[PDB]
Ligand binder design. Structure first.
Ligand SMILES: *[C@@H]1O[C@H](CO)[C@@H](O)[C@H](O)[C@H]1NC(C)=O
Ligand SMILES: [Ca+2]
Ligand SMILES: [Ca+2]
Ligand SMILES: [Ca+2]
Ligand SMILES: [Ca+2]
Lengths: 98, 49, 78, 311, 104, 49, 78
């Protein structure tokens, strides 16, 4: 199972920013112009529409992947082993891997 | 493929090169809210299980 | 953004419909709408207690304190 | 020792972030839920919030929690800290930003705490499912049965190799810093902090002030004020604006990491078996949806697989 | 709700105690429909709450050591707006016109 | 038979002779716990209902 | 009764993982798990408080009481 990591968005007030490529799995970056975000302390930006929010997101392995994961294997002819139990005459049962 | 068994593939559980193929798409944040909304195809491993 | 004359803007920067500017409900977390308001008068058919609470005259001196203060039932008033 | 598990968490502070449902409407919640980890079997879920549990401004104390009260960090005793999906969840343990709860299935996850007369809650839409272990779809961990390996989020706070990054906080926009004063906007700078201001009145002025500063503008609406205080760092939440430059300051270990554990799975009632010529007749009376599988031991397995939900 | 024999106060509640009208501060006023409901607002006889789906509607309040509740059979359903049967208001998505009871 | 209508049978509602045919199997107690776990086929009377 | 070599037996007789033998959590109801623990030291880069707390040096005399008694801000330190 994958995990989607989303870093803090870059909110450019009264201006604009540009997305750049990064070596991250399924990396997404988009600049949304005309945002006017509000925080607990009020309006974050001054300009009404000359602001941009740059959103970034990428895929990571979840914490469960250490334990909850499936292993894909290529299978080729290997070996055949057996545990053999043998007794003869007055000799009691003896066994070994062969 | 996205939403399929192999949507997430890694050569080993500790590798630093991860293959991910999900329709991860950033959506516009809601008016006046600082957040990073996104849509993505549900995990194909969970589906497979 | 700055809002049209149809909407009121709180000191918090957010906008609230003008009809909500003063109606007893703080519509913006900062309370800027209700922080500034004024009280209205009452008809001549209603009595006003010491706290300014209005009560119908039929409730005046009826034995029940129908307002925060007992002025409607105060001996000085009845 | 306990402090050894908070050596890095002591460098971080709680924060206020967007919460989709603060009771009846969206708000900036001090208890905003950042993530819900619910892939464990016996309904164990790990919820990451913006609030800090087990830390106080004065140090470590598992009876205390710390949350932001605007610009000021508040530290209070945990009072009715609760987690709810469809019914109350039993709390297993809590750690900075993280709550471990034993929750039943549900469509939502609600986290909240009380602070005297105030109530802080955050409800997020998140399908929480109960994942039974084995061939029976039991709806609650049984008292007795077959002990099977399962995936659980451990109740231990100790570092087990999973970390999250904590970054320098971004600009904290706060209009309470500005005052009209003598009909001339004054910028109040909290002690030890810096306030960045941006005014676009006839006299456009901007900069970073370390002390009370009087600008040329006469109306607070013409200015913006941002609190710069890097004493304590914050998780790089997707709901907080990023700072300038390389804001990365350190790593915080992820408590209650998923681990392999032994879970008790239900054991269906013993079937009644009747024998006929070359035929096996089974009378199955399950308590919960129970998987029945069969196969021939010959060259053709001819496998059969079906879930038995009723007799 | 919000009224007392002495006047108006949204923190106060009034109910009948037999023949005598009693007025108390709202103490654990709650609404439950298979799960606790978030209270939006209250006015006179009316209580506005955001309730998840359920088969019953339980309303009650406390008056010191006493507990007054009333449970009625009423199917409360979640009615998602649009072309998707979501079970809880999303954090984000498409903003569609809908019918709501105003909190005012 | 267990799980069928007549799994439990009594000549009268006050009879002291009760016939019971359920696959009552005592299970090993969980390690360190004093309890008497058991498996049994659900009542055939409730099933008949 | 004796536990595995990699386990710790609380006075209650219940075995506990040796890794848990001393940490912040009492893993057995009797609490004897942590009763015999010993307090850890802290780096010289952290100002040790009078009452035994330990806070980073950069927080010393910063204008905010980080120790439970404000030792870092008391006039004795600056
Ligand atoms: C071999 O057979 C004898 C008798 O059947 C038995 O006692 C012995 O345990 C067997 N060996 C193994 C390895 O099972
Ligand atoms: Ca209003
Ligand atoms: Ca009267
Ligand atoms: Ca321990
Ligand atoms: Ca200090």
């Amino acid at each position: 199972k994958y995990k989607t990591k989303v870093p803090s968005p870059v909110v450019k007030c009264c201006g604009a920013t540009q997305c750049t490529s990064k070596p991250h799995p399924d990396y997404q970056c988009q600049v949304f112009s005309g945002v006017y975000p509000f925080m607990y302390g009020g309006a974050y930006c001054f300009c009404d529409t000359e602001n941009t929010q740059m959103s970034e997101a990428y895929v990571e392995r979840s914490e469960e992947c250490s334990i909850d994961h499936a292993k894909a294997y290529k299978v080729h002819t290997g070996t055949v082993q057996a545990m053999v139990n043998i007794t003869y005459g007055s000799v009691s049962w003896r066994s070994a891997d062969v | 493929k996205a939403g399929s068994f192999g949507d997430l593939q890694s050569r080993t559980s500790t590798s630093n090169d991860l293959y991910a193929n999900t329709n991860l798409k950033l959506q516009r944040p809601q008016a006046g809210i600082v957040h990073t909304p996104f849509t993505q195809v549900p995990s194909g491993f969970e589906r497979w299980k | 953004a700055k809002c049209e004359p149809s909407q009121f803007q709180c000191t918090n920067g957010r906008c609230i419909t003008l009809l909500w500017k003063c109606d007893g409900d703080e519509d913006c977390v900062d309370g800027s709408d209700e922080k500034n308001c004024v009280k209205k008068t009452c008809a001549e058919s209603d009595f006003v207690c010491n706290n300014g609470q209005c009560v119908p005259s039929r409730w005046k001196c009826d034995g029940d304190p129908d307002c925060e203060d007992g002025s409607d039932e105060s001996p000085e008033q009845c | 020792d306990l402090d050894t598990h908070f050596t890095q968490y002591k460098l971080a502070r709680p924060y206020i972030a967007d919460c989709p449902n603060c009771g009846h409407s969206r708000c900036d919640s001090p208890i905003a839920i950042e993530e819900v980890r619910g892939d464990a079997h016996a309904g164990v879920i790990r919820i990451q919030t913006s609030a800090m549990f087990g830390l106080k401004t004065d140090g470590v104390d598992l009876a205390y929690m710390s949350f932001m009260n605007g610009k000021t960090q508040k530290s209070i005793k945990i009072d009715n800290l609760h987690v709810r999906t469809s019914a109350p969840c039993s709390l297993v343990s809590h750690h900075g930003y993280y709550i471990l709860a034993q929750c039943p299935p549900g469509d939502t996850v609600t986290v909240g705490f009380h602070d005297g007369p105030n109530r802080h809650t955050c409800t997020v839409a998140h399908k929480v499912e109960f994942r039974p272990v084995g061939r029976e779809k039991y709806r609650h961990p049984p008292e007795h049965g077959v002990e099977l390996p399962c995936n659980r989020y451990t109740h231990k706070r100790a570092d087990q190799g999973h970390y999250v990054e904590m970054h320098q906080p971004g600009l904290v926009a706060d209009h309470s810093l500005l005052s009209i004063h003598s009909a001339k906007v004054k910028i109040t700078v909290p002690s030890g902090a810096q306030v960045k201001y941006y005014c676009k009145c006839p006299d456009v002025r901007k900069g970073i002030t370390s002390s009370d500063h009087t600008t040329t503008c006469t109306d607070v609406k013409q200015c913006r004020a941002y609190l710069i205080d890097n004493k304590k760092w914050v998780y790089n939440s997707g709901r907080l604006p990023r700072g300038e430059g390389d804001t990365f300051k350190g790593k915080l270990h992820v408590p209650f990491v998923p681990v392999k554990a032994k879970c008790i799975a239900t054991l269906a009632p013993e079937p009644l078996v009747e024998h006929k010529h070359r035929t096996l007749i089974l009378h199955l009376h399950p308590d919960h949806p129970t998987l029945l599988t069969t196969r021939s031991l010959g060259s053709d397995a001819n496998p059969t697989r079906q879930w038995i939900e009723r007799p």
